[PDB]
Amino acid sequence: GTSNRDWWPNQLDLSILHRHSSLSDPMGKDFNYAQAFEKLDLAAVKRDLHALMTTSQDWWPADFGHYGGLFIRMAWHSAGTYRTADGRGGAGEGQQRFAPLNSFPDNANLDKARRLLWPIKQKYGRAISWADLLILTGNVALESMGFKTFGFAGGRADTWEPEDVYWGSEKIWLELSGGPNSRYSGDRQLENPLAAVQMGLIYVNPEGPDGNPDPVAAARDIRDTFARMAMNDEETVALIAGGHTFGKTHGAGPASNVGAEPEAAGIEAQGLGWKSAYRTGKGADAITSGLEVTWTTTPTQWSHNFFENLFGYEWELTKSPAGAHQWVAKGADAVIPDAFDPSKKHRPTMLTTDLSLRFDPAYEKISRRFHENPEQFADAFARAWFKLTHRDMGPRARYLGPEVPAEVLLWQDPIPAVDHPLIDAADAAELKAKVLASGLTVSQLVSTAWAAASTFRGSDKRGGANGARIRLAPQKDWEANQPEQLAAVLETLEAIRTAFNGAQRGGKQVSLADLIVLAGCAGVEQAAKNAGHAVTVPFAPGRADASQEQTDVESMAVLEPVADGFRNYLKGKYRVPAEVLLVDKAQLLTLSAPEMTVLLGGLRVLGANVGQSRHGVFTAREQALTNDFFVNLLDMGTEWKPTAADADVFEGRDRATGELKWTGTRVDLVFGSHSQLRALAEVYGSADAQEKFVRDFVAVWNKVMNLDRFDLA
Amino acid sequence: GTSNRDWWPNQLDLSILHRHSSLSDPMGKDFNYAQAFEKLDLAAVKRDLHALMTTSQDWWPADFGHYGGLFIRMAWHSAGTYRTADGRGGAGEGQQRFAPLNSFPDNANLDKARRLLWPIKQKYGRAISWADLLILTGNVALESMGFKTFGFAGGRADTWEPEDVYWGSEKIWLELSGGPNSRYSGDRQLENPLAAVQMGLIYVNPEGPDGNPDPVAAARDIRDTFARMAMNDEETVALIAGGHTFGKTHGAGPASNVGAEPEAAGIEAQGLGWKSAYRTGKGADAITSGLEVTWTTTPTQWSHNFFENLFGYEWELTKSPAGAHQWVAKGADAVIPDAFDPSKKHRPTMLTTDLSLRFDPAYEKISRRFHENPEQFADAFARAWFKLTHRDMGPRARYLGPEVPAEVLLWQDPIPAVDHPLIDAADAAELKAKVLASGLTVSQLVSTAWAAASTFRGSDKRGGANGARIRLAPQKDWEANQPEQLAAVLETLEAIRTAFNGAQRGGKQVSLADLIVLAGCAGVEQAAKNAGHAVTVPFAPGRADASQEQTDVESMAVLEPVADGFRNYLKGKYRVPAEVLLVDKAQLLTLSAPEMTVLLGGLRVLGANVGQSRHGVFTAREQALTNDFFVNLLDMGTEWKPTAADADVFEGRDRATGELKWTGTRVDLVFGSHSQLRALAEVYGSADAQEKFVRDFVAVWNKVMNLDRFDLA
Ligand code: HEM
Ligand code: HEM
């Protein structure tokens, strides 16, 4: 079946924008998961999960009679695909149950873990999502084994198809670095947005970098990958030592005994994979990673035995029954229990990556403190396990149920509570009028509000205009935000805000976060009026202003737009074509192709470009909201050519006269090139489309203004 | 960017069911194209098109000063991708403007034709679709050149993305037969569902079969491809000779001068392709097919000159300036005008495929009759041009505007007008009660109504329950329809109908078509009641009964379900896996993944399987409407294995006891295998889903019952 992808491999793919349609969703269009979950009897679900932990099924017998370690690993894998660079991956959509993650090598036998959970999923139905269930199950495993967790929030709605995530360019599972699609260059520099060392791994290779069992060098990979999953040294030590307090790895026999991953298995496997020909294929004979390590003397109970062993023995390199490198404490007594045979005992063992916690000098200091003070270890682990499993859930207003922690954490980009009456429709009209009377232009109002709102990304639900973080470090100095123009706009808006608030009774006041958005709305209103149309742009108050001290500057760095086609902005020269970056940004803002098209065409004529560029400003009435972008783009009287100076910039010349009419970028002209985008541009470029363009613009503008407004959900 | 496709090429792709979502569509969810078109001033559009004909643009100068031949070819390419095997392709969705058809080699320079039409599209906007516009423009070209058409209907709504059509497996454009992905086997047998000889062609190669200039062998390709586009010999001769009464071919220079097709061109080409380095690259220097043939002495006027030339000369094989095989008239004078130079004249020329009309013995008789009786030629061509350009539009009720021909044609599968009062809700209750009192079972009622309704396909809008064609040849004899059981159900329904009709006043009567569907509804009602649910199934009256003489038996053959997963039916052993055929069927029935899932699971427990097979009947209460299919399918206490006798049949055994619990086919078990389908099955197999399953079932059942009900649009 020869496809468009086969014929035109470098044509833009828009299907990423049309995933998650109502058509693939089996739940009614009005189904609200938050309301279902809020009525779940969470305590009853947790009791059933508690019981499950020790109810072994013969098709996948529980190690030591307890599935707790398997489920912790399952819930760490669920969360562990997260990358800070784009916010993609993580636990928040239950993507572990779909391709390709369900079949990543690192997720081997998590298909069994998920299947164990079906009777509980089935019992509670739509009141608990798979996504929430995987995480809750990990918490319950922890709790059943004597570990007090930090809390749990529901609200991760299920999804119904694979996300399209860029996992890397390798064509071979687990390919070692330095291949033709190497994800490394330079001095072991991992390409953004990746956060793992090989295709099909969660973070690092447990044997060591490309299989070399050097704990020192492995620690560098750990540090780099975990940092790209938003974890610092302290959290990383706490997470790895915490998790490896439980359970065991599986490598009872040679790896070549293991069959097809789930997406390649026969239909009879019924969604399961990695069927093994080694002895019984399961339990005592299980093969999962090929390693055979059990870390502690009580693999079903919380302890501080991981660090007691790590520091209390000297380690020697050895091989599992599958031939993988691992470490044994040879001077030791056989104090580790066997998973199935009460009359066998084993010496303590470790992975190369476990020894990293001791032989990296910075990790060693933390691991020693944790060893000496296991109560500090427990607290750091609980906090980190909460952060790991909740990092992609977005603002605190999405957290549901009775176990949400009250403590506000800095990583959550917190927004203060509103404790005063909000502005009403009449107040909003007064403020818009005052904004327009101050002299701020359509261009400044639209640019500023776009800058504040468009940091939002739906991947991890970070960013957006709530908080007024555009006035704080680092957003106020981002190049895309035009720091000097921004500072002048904000200074004027702040004076309007102070005057309005100082004149109120009854405690009523407006936040700067709200006023920035409302000022953008005035700007769009004025632009429509400049074109002869009276429109009201909807506006929802209730944003609040976060302080600098409530804003982690370093974690905010990943939200900087280095490409924003909606402002014709590219921070430097990238290997990825600019139109590809445009579609990527549109996906992160949750826009369909039509929404992207209308939004860009309007922004262009409103003066939202960075630096006042003329590129794509195909209008003689800038700051009027018209469909000029599309009418002039599609005009066959204009002929386009790449410039000599820059092949990514184009001149549009009158085809008869040679006269220079416009210039544009690849982001501009793709709307007149790509056959699906041009079809869209034609709608908005048609003679009956002026009203539709204005209405659809205003609707998409409003959608972007409200992206982070889960307080109104 | 390594994808799921790359990793698992034999994992079922469901995205074909979720195309044409509201997300990719720029028009509102309420936009109704029929209503927009009904207000278009069609006369004014036609005036503008007449003016266009001779308004030459410098970027693609009009041959002979008239774009008429270019536009006829454009409109015959639009319609010419149609295949009767699945109803896919054709003009009815305006797919020529998207990939891959916009870049098929056979559509070279039709990108210019469509660009000439942009000013008119733009002027009238949403009130005329591109899809309608391409065909209208062809009609107007014909009329401008002195040929009176048979009529025109609007109502082809635009689409907004590529359809996923199987065009063949070749990975090289135009690949000749016998390659690794050959579309031919045996004695030049073209694989279904294909209706062209090479990848990127409309029907046949104009040089001859695989480029061999044998007009006799070409005629065999012509006959076979045109038959697979629903045209007989008479229509085929009329169409080819009719079209080649106008215009010319383009091959002024070597084909190596021609650059990238539109989907491969640079962004600056703004959606156009095949830019040529030969001289001016256009007009007198145009290169399109590589052939250089002008058929008649008046290429811009209707004439009888095609047949005069074809019979009046003897032909000699020669080469165009591009090197293609073509034919020139022996000894003739230079009587053909040049397209640009009034002082140049040319000898009559022909394609190998034109000579087929003379040297194939059956075509020769028709061509001679057309030569001797030009009025029969003109009438046959008008009729065939109307059929070509409307064959995929569906029932007459979809035909809009003031030029619809009143004459009813056999190919339209016509349905008689209803000329009597319809049954009301009280009559429907009475009839359902009589149906249930007759002794017909849930299984018989559901199977019969499924059989009648599910012949519909949305690709060309043929089939469905309107007409009661299930009682006529050939449907009554189709194996999937269980001819003997069917005859007994119809016999009982026919008696109920006659008794009801005989007791009425005022001329009220019920059609057998309606009663079949109503009886299916009663069956579903009874099944819900067997499971303790009180369900009323919607029913819309108004179908009529078509006669045998209104039902072309041969044209009806392509609607025979040779695979119907909804009845666990496969007529023979196919190279395409059965689950792939299931998704294909779902696509033709216009169902989403959720709808397909719910529908199949219900039909299984209602007894809709062909031959009473137990396969997939995972219930101990057959003929009760429950979600048993899903609950049993997902039960991990059962293990599945392919049978020894047949690898496509599976046994599900109790994992503890080894006892046989069920059997199932690939179609059954794919729901427990594929990770997206299993996610859907889990919703319906959950403890809170019994009522949701019943309601969703009824909704999809009713959707299938109404698929052809364009009289209710
Ligand atoms: C450097 C990071 C890490 C690496 C390289 C790593 C590696 C592995 C490997 C190879 C296995 C064995 C899989 C098998 O053969 O069954 C495993 C098991 C496990 N890991 Fe990790 N791990 C990492 C971090 C984590 C974290 C952060 C957690 C949780 C907080 C976690 C919890 C576990 C648990 C509970 C198991 C036991 C599975 C069972 O009992 O079946 N690990 N780990
Ligand atoms: C056996 C079937 C056919 C073959 C192999 C065929 C082949 C071709 C080829 C190769 C061209 C030249 C393209 C170019 O170089 O610009 C052409 C032109 C054309 N054909 Fe056909 N054709 C077929 C049937 C039809 C039919 C059914 C129609 C209309 C009813 C049609 C109408 C036209 C017209 C009007 C042109 C002239 C285009 C112009 O003036 O630019 N043809 N044909």
Ligand SMILES: NNC(=O)c1ccncc1
């Ligand atoms: N490829 N096109 C089709 O199969 C189709 C189009 C519209 N409705 C149903 C099927």
Ligand SMILES: [Cl-]
């Ligand atoms: Cl994702």
Ligand SMILES: [Cl-]
């Ligand atoms: Cl199609």
Ligand code: NA
């Ligand atoms: Na994410």
Ligand code: NA
């Ligand atoms: Na079709």
